[PDB]
Amino acid sequence: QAAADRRTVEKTWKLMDKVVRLCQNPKLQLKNSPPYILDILPDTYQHLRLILSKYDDNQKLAQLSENEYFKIYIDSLMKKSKRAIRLFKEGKERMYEEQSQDRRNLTKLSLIFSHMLAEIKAIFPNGQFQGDNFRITKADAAEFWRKFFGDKTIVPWKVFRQCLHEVHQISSGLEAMALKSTIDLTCNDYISVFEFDIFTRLFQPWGSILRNWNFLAVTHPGYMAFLTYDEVKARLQKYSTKPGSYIFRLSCTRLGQWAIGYVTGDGNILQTIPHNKPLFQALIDGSREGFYLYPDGRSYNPDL
């Protein structure tokens, strides 16, 4: 990780600007729906401009430029922005085909950028680095983080995996690789305390977290990962005549929280946020009551 001096941070601004120009192409017919690069990248430049404003003398810039998280962040942003630029160049006319693999990769990158924005606003609230004070929401998860990493804001994946394995054993590399793609929202091969917080909130309780993660995100056909409210309604339309069809999903706008969509006996699509109980438990309760019967339309619910 190169040092994050103002020259480097500015070089990243120019790259993001290219991505914004490329995404303004009308032939693209880009829909205003989260994650929306034309919101995320400008807001990211703004937050970076804020951070740099605070580190105004030369002993502050030495702090910021040497900040391990910030060094990693700026390097990711530059790599992801170069990737996006490469995507349009190599994708050429295939970028206007709203269903092409080139546009799907652009959507993948827009999620990442969105996750990176939420992270930096969390780690640098109001441009001031607060990474070592970040309060992990689940207490037993926070015990784990402080025990093995203490004050750190960001941790190499390999380090994180070995320490997690001491407490919750991973069965295989394929599992570890699926776990990585789940926890590592920003796809930078690191685990920040923000990503850890999102993960242990989604798949609580900590004491059985890997079982919960497998049950919800690996083996459950009802899991849909990131969808907007409208996208949930759209996907369930084909099942509006099959009450009990349901899916559950995440929101890139409100990380760390689950939502469920399901079809009522009348053929209506309702969506609900399970406040104050783990998702696997809401699904188990929901199944018994007769609401959550056919995950994504299949004919049986996965075995608890």
Ligand SMILES: COc1cc([N+](=O)[O-])cc([C@H]2N(C(=O)COc3ccc4ccc(OC)c(CC(=O)O)c4n3)[C@@H](C)c3cccc(=O)n32)c1C
């Ligand atoms: C039971 O009533 C609801 C259930 C859901 N619903 O299940 O989607 C959504 C809505 C409500 N909205 C919100 O409440 C937004 O505030 C939150 C707060 C926490 C959230 C946690 C997770 C989550 O999903 C991962 C969402 C929804 C999202 O981010 O998309 C959250 N939204 C937004 C979206 C919206 C858009 C269009 C119609 C609509 O009614 N609403 C209501 C009342």
Ligand SMILES: [Mg+2]
């Ligand atoms: Mg990461």
